[PDB]
């Protein structure tokens, strides 16, 4: 088992930390990014993004549905390749496989 649950944290951390502005647009708006983990709002998102990672492992991922859900926070193709620089450095800081062919399959809906 990869701990993807803490390369979620990671992740999130490098994400916030390069676009603070991305964090306005969750219900942790304006909570110190040093303090994510203790934010129960961010606890349910992390947990979902861990969810769909399990699912794009597993095959089960609906890539297509989770571009239109982020279409719908008016969150596109800029922000997922941002993301997929973050997820890059998140993995590799936890020797996980990389996410980029996952992030691929939802950008290439958007
Ligand atoms: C690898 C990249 C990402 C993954 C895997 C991912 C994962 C998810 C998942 C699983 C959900 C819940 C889907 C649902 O059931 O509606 C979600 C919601 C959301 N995503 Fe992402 N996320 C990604 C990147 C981003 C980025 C770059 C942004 C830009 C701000 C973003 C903004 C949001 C917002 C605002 C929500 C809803 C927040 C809420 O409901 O309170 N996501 N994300
Ligand atoms: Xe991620
Ligand atoms: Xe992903």
Avoid at 77 to 101: I, R, V
């Amino acid at each position: 088992m990869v701990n993807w649950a803490a390369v979620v944290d990671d992740f999130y951390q490098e994400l916030f930390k390069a676009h603070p502005e991305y964090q306005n647009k969750f219900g942790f708006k304006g909570v110190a990014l040093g303090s994510l983990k203790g934010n129960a709002a961010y606890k349910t998102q992390a947990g979902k993004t861990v969810d769909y990672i399990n699912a794009a492992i597993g095959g089960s991922a609906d890539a297509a549905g989770l571009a239109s859900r982020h279409k719908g926070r008016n969150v596109g193709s800029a922000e997922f390749h941002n993301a997929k620089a973050c997820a890059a450095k998140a993995c590799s800081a936890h020797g996980a496989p990389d996410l980029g062919h996952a992030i691929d399959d939802i950008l290439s809906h958007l």
